[PDB]
């Protein structure tokens, strides 16, 4: 096929930031380059046609250019409506291919997390189960990594992770973990942590709870 | 304002088939070829094939033949893709978009909503919701954090809110995750000390395809 590579796959650029998105693909596509838009909650909008410089009517801040296997989109300056995935496609050969997607984000100020736990909710416990939850809140950068331990040792099994979208007024992530333990393992231990890395701290930041202190 | 509507069938168990429907509208329906794309969650977009409905017809990306078959209906003007023998693989969100010549080549320049695929082995099943009290050692000491746990439900979606939707400022909802064949998410808002427990905080989760309603209040201890 002809593969269409992109460069880079994430870009965090700051609103107001003149922002260039590349592609490439494996042979000379003639200039049949169309780029499109993926929103959040994924509408896909054509933004720009035959080989980046014809505009469909989406904003004039969005123009293309490129010859042969190197096409660029460039945002000249960035608005909040445009964090987005933006998609090119060679319409040179069959099959249509696409490239591999850029996500975009807003950069910003460091923040750091707010973490909080929470034990089992009696309810669960009639039912047998015990989840234990981790919210950490409102940080930038996306990247952290979270760990649990009981009494002493393993985050590993039972553990679901989920991450919001960027905020779109402050402009950080939220993320849950959970883990799940069946009542009567849960009964078998002391403490329960959550234990966070954020390169915004050397010191993880930790949360726990014992079990009767409650 | 051309449009393109689209809906077939979303949750089908694995050896099924599906045919979705691509309704389109705002132009000569003969006039253009319609094209089908797979997006598989984990982001990419693939291309499926072509079916132009006046100018003759058909093409296939060599992947899908054969377990993809696109018709279309002319007087209704409606695009079908009906997919074969259903897999783990073929749980996706599948767009139809419109060609358009361009001197030299063709623009998808209108797309669907796109249809939602789930292949799965669940069946309808409300949540568990259970309140999320801070714990033990007194916490969240400023602003207090409470939570809800939605746990074992199917279909997507569900809705979370709380005190009805009065209290929308501060409140974090996770995207639900799959876990085994069920979702689960998550809510948490963080609220002034001085509103609880003085104030009742009750997280309101619907789930409209099992017809439920359930209303947690967030109390004290576990």
């Known amino acids: 096929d002809i593969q269409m590579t992109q460069i880079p796959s994430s870009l965090s650029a700051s609103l107001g930031d003149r922002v260039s998105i590349s592609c490439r693909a494996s042979?000379?596509?003639?200039?049949?380059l169309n780029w499109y838009q993926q929103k959040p909650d994924g509408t896909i909008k054509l933004l720009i046609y035959?080989?980046?410089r014809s505009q469909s009517g989406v904003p004039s801040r969005f123009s293309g250019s490129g010859s042969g296997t190197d096409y660029s989109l460039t945002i000249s300056n960035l608005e909040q409506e445009d964090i987005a995935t933006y998609f090119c496609?060679?319409?040179?050969?069959?099959?249509?291919?696409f490239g591999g997607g850029t996500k975009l984000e807003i950069k910003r100020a460091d923040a750091a997390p707010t973490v909080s736990i929470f034990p089992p909710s009696s309810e669960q416990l009639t039912s047998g189960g015990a989840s234990v939850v981790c919210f950490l809140n409102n940080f930038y950068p996306k990247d952290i990594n979270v760990k649990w331990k009981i009494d002493g040792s393993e985050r590993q099994n039972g553990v679901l992770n989920s991450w919001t979208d960027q905020d779109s007024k402050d402009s950080t992530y939220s993320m849950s973990s959970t883990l799940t333990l069946t009542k009567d393992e849960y009964e078998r231990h002391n403490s329960y942590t959550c234990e966070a890395t954020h390169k915004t701290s050397t010191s993880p930041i930790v949360k726990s709870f014992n079990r009767n202190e409650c | 304002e051309v449009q393109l509507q689209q809906s077939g069938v979303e949750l089908v168990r694995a050896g099924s088939s599906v045919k979705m429907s691509c309704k389109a509208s705002?132009?000569?329906?003969?006039?253009?070829?319609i094209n089908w794309v797979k997006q598989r969650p984990g982001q990419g977009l693939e291309w499926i094939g072509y079916?132009?409905?006046?100018?003759?017809?058909?093409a296939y990306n060599e992947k899908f033949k054969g377990k993809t078959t696109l018709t279309v209906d002319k007087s209704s003007s409606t695009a079908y893709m009906q997919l074969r023998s259903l897999t783990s693989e073929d749980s996706a969100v599948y767009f139809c978009?419109?060609?358009?010549?361009?001197?030299?080549?063709?623009?998808?320049?209108?797309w669907g909503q796109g249809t939602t695929l789930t292949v799965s082995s669940a069946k309808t099943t409300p949540p568990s919701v259970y309140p999320l009290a801070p714990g033990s050692a007194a916490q969240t000491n400023s602003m207090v954090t409470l939570g809800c746990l939605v746990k074992g439900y199917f279909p997507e979606p569900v809705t979370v809110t709380w005190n009805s939707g009065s209290l929308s400022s501060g409140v974090h909802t996770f995207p639900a995750v799959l876990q085994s064949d069920l979702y689960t998410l998550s809510s948490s808002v963080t609220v002034p000390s001085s509103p609880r427990p003085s104030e009742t905080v009750t997280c309101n989760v619907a789930h409209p395809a099992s017809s439920t309603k359930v209303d947690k209040k967030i109390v004290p201890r576990d």
């Open positions: 079916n132009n409905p006046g100018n003759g017809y058909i």
């Open positions: 042979q000379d596509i003639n200039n049949f």
């Open positions: 496609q060679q319409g040179n050969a069959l099959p249509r291919t």
């Open positions: 035959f080989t980046s």
């Open positions: 705002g132009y000569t329906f003969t006039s253009n070829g």
């Open positions: 978009a419109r060609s358009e010549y361009y001197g030299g080549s063709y623009k998808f320049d209108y």
